[PDB]
Amino acid sequence: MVLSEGEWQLVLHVWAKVEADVAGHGQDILIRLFKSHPETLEKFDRFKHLKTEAEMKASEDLKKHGVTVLTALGAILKKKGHHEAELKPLAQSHATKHKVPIKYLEFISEAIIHVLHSRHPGNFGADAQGAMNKALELFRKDIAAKYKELGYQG
């Protein structure tokens, strides 16, 4: 798939607002993921012990990982589809080391969309949401193709 320039502009416009508070958005997204799909917490040996939302909010380690996740995703979105070099090491770690199925990447995609709609309603109307969904679908489609090349396919 291919996004139009206008689609990328909608994506990068709301992303610029996210970037005013990367740590805050990263915490909100991971907490939303873990609340909505508890099974995904199981993949994180680092965070598996956290019992409540309150404990998640207080964790410095979870906030640091939120920043890592959004910084990587930001770097990919800013390539506007030209992201093959960026995606290779991420696909390799997530297939071979962390064993993250494609379904869980759909779950975090949903979490991203929920938080942007909650925090940026004026810059995340229907057309901007459609553009962000397309961008995240492109990301998942290309990571899935790399999973297959690497021997995981899950």
Ligand code: HEM
């Ligand atoms: C937008 C999607 C995602 C991005 C951009 C992303 C990014 C990253 C990055 C950059 C790292 C550190 C370097 C590495 O190990 O590759 C990482 C680590 C990790 N990711 Fe992801 N990730 C994503 C989705 C997920 C999902 C959905 C899961 C599991 C449900 C997951 C599980 C892990 C685990 C277990 C680690 C290691 C954490 C630790 O340090 O103990 N990732 N991810």
